[model samples]
Target: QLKESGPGLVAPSQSLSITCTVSGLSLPGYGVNWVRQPPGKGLEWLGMIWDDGRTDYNSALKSRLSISKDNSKSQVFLKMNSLQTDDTARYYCVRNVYWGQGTLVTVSAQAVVTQESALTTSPGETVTLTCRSSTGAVTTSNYANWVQEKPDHLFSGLISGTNNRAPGVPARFSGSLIGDTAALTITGAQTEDEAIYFCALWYSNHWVFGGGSKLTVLGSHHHHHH
Candidate 1:
């Protein structure tokens, strides 16, 4: 069994820390992994630390994330700098296949957006991807943006704000606010659009991403033969 301890609240631009205290098992034989899940959202893999002091992290967070351990204390540590509202989530510590319950971390009055865990649509159909903030309604000044995560974590920036694309995004993606919610509207959805879509917002000198929406383009049965 493992237990987690750490502060539950933090501020943007600050550092956040968590400690996992282990028991009922020895730490010398297994690696410890850290994972997080936002409220009403799916899990995100942060990184892992092995007993031999080897570490691996999510590429998006590698620059600001750190994992270490105190072998004498039977504890593992997770530290992240420049915390943002999107960093607010329930963090867990896992060994082998068992994990601790998790501890919630919140960032005060900042932007924490979330989308539907999964969405489905057919080719040539239109799909509206929605993201909402936890602190309050999202407004245009938030500079809401969207990105697509293809298989194997390949990322492509989509729309930002009303109609702007990050760089190479296609015209099929558009951004807007619907009744205080930030949305990415996809016109003529295609099989290539089957990927995880994430909404982001620039706030407090940092950018935060929504948990992500897994978009699935359902196959069509109709066929044409010339």
Candidate 2:
């Protein structure tokens, strides 16, 4: 973990910088991301960064966040402004594995910086969730799993639809790879899986994940996809 102390704080609408250190072994196609979880809600996908400086923000948060990179030193910078009380969530800088642990920044004020190309099919069609690293040319050949976050446990991969609670997951909810892309699919639709679907790949100590796509499981129809 890389860290530096600034004014020790910033006011509302001001900017703040937090440093991160990424070292050690290799995990391909994986980069870093910034996420926020408000006091009483699920995680939010603020944005993500590639080692190459590429980033994507949640369609809902694009206007207030921005991310940049310095590849030569393997550093990332985030800048967020026009702060509101609603922005008072825990800001995390994490790699797939070596997270800073308890280093979430309390955004009294700060700056933030902030893939994909499967086609958008019809409602009953197939929706594939893919996970790839931001490193060099890495593929799903590496171990990648889809885990569901619930009010109870942090469930394991819902592969082939065989696990315990993961079994009830539809068949369309699949896991696989196409070259460098690691993907997860949610076939039918219900009021669940909408919690937070995490694309995780285990590494050194813990697991690395994409900035979670906060799902609001709108009550509706159901199809067996897993």
Candidate 3:
């Protein structure tokens, strides 16, 4: 686990820096990376520092970006200079296991809504839900996310990070990354599955969700008799 700390506001060529504190060991033997996101935009790779103390940056930010570590404090650092309004973003401190909180830098200034209305599927049938981006293709940079909303506002994450199933989710639920969209397919629908299914795309900037599908699963029993 990792914890991140940084300022939320920006000050008027201002330099901004953030820190990530690791709760686990091997900081000096692992790579710590950083990514940025503009308001309502996708993730933008910033750079990373290797265990050997070497660092790399997004070519666009190479000249002004700085990534370092403080072994004494178990913290990693990210700093950038030559600030401009265009540089403002939600900067995140990332590593292999997970990611920490993000900082909204003011280098200057800054900064999806859409899904299906309903989907009908019969019990024992298969159904698939897709999440598509309007601005561009749905790539791995933004994790494909799926969620289920049961009665009384109960919710559960069904699929995450493109294809990983959440705890407690059955094998019937699976996620896939196709060409331009990310999808979640449900095999052998059940009555309990009759709920609102929401599809989301989590970007470094923010999580964009669709309106959600009111999935109605028709029972497999005999037809109605009048």
Candidate 4:
């Protein structure tokens, strides 16, 4: 029942520390996960929590990552060795799809980026965007919205499925709502879709994104655009 503000986002090569607060600190299988959604990108599962002192890292990045925790502080630290240009993306610390504050790590080395809804897709691959309302009282409206920066680069409503997408987005992309979890899925990702895939819920005037997901398309294809 505890909640997390987020896994702070930071620039590449910089140290990252995220604090999470939960209700049942003593429960089994209750730990935070470090996941990154690149600026205008896709979701990358960094690692997970285990009752044991150890963690599981994404095999692709195990060489330069480590996870540690301070039970007393209820915080987790992600130590990354050497930063690079490719690492310039939004980083999020999350649990069971429930979100917290996300840190935007960029090459500019700024402290943060304003919250925005975006989605990026790599060519030929499908991309998924997500949104949720982690905080809701009996009187509060729990909801989420998905937006695609239209061809003009303006925030356009995509689909709104019980706090999911906004509306008018193609059928290739879709969203769903499950109690407290709201998810958005896109099929046939396009290079033009390379904007930013963001999941946001309303909390007063500010909107919160689930870290950030970017899509970078590789390879080429033969298309008949007739």
Per residue, candidate 1 scores C-alpha lDDT tens digits across 130-220 of: 9898867888777786767666434455776545665546788888889978888999999999999877664533456688899999986
Greater lDDT among 1 and 3 belongs to 1
TM-score of each: 0.52, 0.46, 0.52, 0.43
In terms of lDDT, the poorest run of 10 residues in model 2 is: 110-119
TM-score of 1: 0.52
Superposition error at 12 for model 4 (Å): 6.2
- Give candidate 1's root-mean-square deviation (CA, Å): 13.4
Give the least accurate 10-residue stretch of model 4, judged by summed lDDT: 110-119
Candidate 3 local lDDT, 59-161, one digit each (tens): 6677888999987897889888767777778777766434565667765341153466788999999998777777677888777778776664344668877
lDDT score of residue 53 within candidate 1? 88
What tens digits encode model 4's per-residue C-alpha lDDT throughout 177-226? 54445666667866566665555453432234455445454556678797
Tell me the RMSD of model 4 versus the true structure. Answer: 14.9
Candidate No. with top lDDT: 1
Off by over 4 Å in 2: 1-8, 107-226
Report lDDT (Cα) of residue 204, candidate 2: 28
Looking at candidate 1, the ten consecutive residues that score lowest on lDDT are 200-209
Q: Which residue pairs show backbone clashes in model 3?
A: none
For each predicted model, how many residue pairs clash, with residues at least 3 apart or on different chains? 0, 26, 0, 32
Cα lDDT computed for each candidate against the true fold:
0.78, 0.53, 0.73, 0.53
* Model 1 clash tally, residue pairs: 0
